[PDB]
């Protein structure tokens, strides 16, 4: 017999990114339900070492590799630097991690990430880790535009800047999602869609210095499409999201 | 007698902002030492409800107003959303806070902030809170460019984007500081200074899509000055920083 030989198939990694509280962990659970309901084998990787309660069962869990509170004590750091270094420490255990990855056998692998967006936008950590965990496989990032933050036009545009910094750093395609869309009224959603798909957002800014205006002009001039509206609680928009994942990975 | 009548003088609020671990809390302590060594009356406000150990004695402390861990339990949130909501909860106690502010009597008030930069760049929380705590007084924000992150040109430019989003949202002038400069060699510092003061950074980018290039061009075209090099551990650059604070507040 040969016990090194395992059944092989395609694996697709889906990294769910977003600001604090934008709904990443809930969406991972909802997207896993959706994919399994459609007979698509799906596993979950939790990369947040600080989370306490999860609505899903992670197949790989960062909390078994690094103790955040032990880090904050052993290095005398602040609450946020401690979470950054903890994620950084994951890469020191690349040996143990690659073994867990090897023994993982799933067609779709959902990666829940911490709601510290500087790890993906302002540091190399997000790129190095995401490339390490998805090595040898196609990947896509899903970035969550929090609906609560997006209904304000100036706040919406800052999130497009943030998402662009992530896309530039991470080495994979990115899908934009408008998360928690149930928090919006019909008129708010339509107004936001017109802001983007028609460029009218530039008028909702009013008093803006010349510098910020030039950034905004560049953003709006390169807005390809409106973020996919998703509501994990209402379990809506997951088919659009999964249709775009398939279009991107193909 | 009239016991409502207190001695009045000018107060200047200095908000120290920056990415996780950029050195905010250490710089606050160093800047307080510097100002007191020069016979300048200085108090400290700690706005980070999650910090465990501080090198200074805060005159107002957010931890006495909100319990972060109690928030994460009572609302079933993640580790980062819990810290955002905790800061948000501070404004619910505006009554108690304004009383502490009133009873504060200091010429310079240093405000240590949490290393969750979305509170200042991607949410209104930072603006509302900073305006509330400094009401009736001149204020300045000090944003920390972490030297470790700034030595990579693409990482430096993303931090200029981030600092611009903060400056646009916060309603006060902002001073840029290159923190932890002791981590850099002489050649690295000079190279970074040439990147900015001469615009040569645009060549250190190499393979860049057209969209990211247009953002970078706008950033570099509006780089007024190089961030002030500060090293709290070497206690250097604090006089330059304090000379610029005075120039801005005047
Ligand atoms: N080399 C060097 N290290 C510094 C300097 N200032 C702070 N540090 C170190 O960098 C780490 C972060 O310092 P700290 O003041 O807590 O930064 P913070 O930005 O408040 N962290 P947080 O975002 O978690 O609140 C600590 O190890 C501190 O000793 C500096 O000027 N040089
Ligand atoms: N209305 C609404 N609330 C949602 C939705 N998805 C999540 N939430 C709620 O929003 C809060 C944040 O959800 P959570 O999945 O933990 O988000 P997270 O982005 O992983 N948080 P963190 O950044 O701290 O890890 C929770 O109260 C969750 O119930 C949604 O689609 N609609
Ligand atoms: Cl890092
Ligand atoms: Cl908010
Ligand atoms: Mg989460
Ligand atoms: Mg701190």
Numbering used by the authors:
A (entry chain A), B (entry chain A): -9 to 240
Question: What does the original paper state about this entry?
Answer:
Structural analysis of the GTP- and GDP-bound states of the Sulfolobus acidocaldarius GPN enzyme (SaGPN) showed that this central GPN-loop GTPase adopts two distinct quaternary structures. The general structure of SaGPN involves 12 α-helices and a five-stranded, parallel β-sheet that is sandwiched by α6/α8 and α1/α12, respectively. The dimer interface emerges alongside the surface of helices α3, α5, α8, and α11, whereby α8 contributes substantially to the dimeric assembly due to its central position allowing the formation of a hydrophobic pocket.
In the GTP-bound form, the γ-phosphate induces a closed dimeric arrangement by interacting with the GPN region that is relaxed upon hydrolysis to GDP. The eponymous GPN motif (residues G68-N70) is found at the base of α3 (residues N70-L81), which is involved in activation of the inline attacking water molecule (N70) and nucleotide coordination at the substrate pocket of the second protomer. Notably, the water that is suitably positioned for inline attack has still a distance of 3.4 Å from the γ-phosphate of the GppNHp substrate mimic. Additionally, the Walker A motif (GxxxxGK[T/S], x = any amino acid) takes part in nucleotide binding, whereas K14 is responsible for the coordination and orientation of the β/γ phosphates of the nucleotide; T15 is the only proteinaceous part of the octahedral Mg2+ coordination sphere. Mg2+ coordination is also supported by the Walker B motif (hhhhD/E, h = hydrophobic), which interacts indirectly with the Mg2+ ion over a water bridge to D102; the latter residue also forms a hydrogen bond with the hydroxyl moiety of T15. When deprotonated, D38 acts here as a general base for transient formation of the attacking hydroxide nucleophile like the corresponding residue in the G2 box of other SIMIBI GTPases. Overall, the GTP-bound state of GPN-loop GTPases with its closed GPN-lid corresponds to a ‘locked’ state.
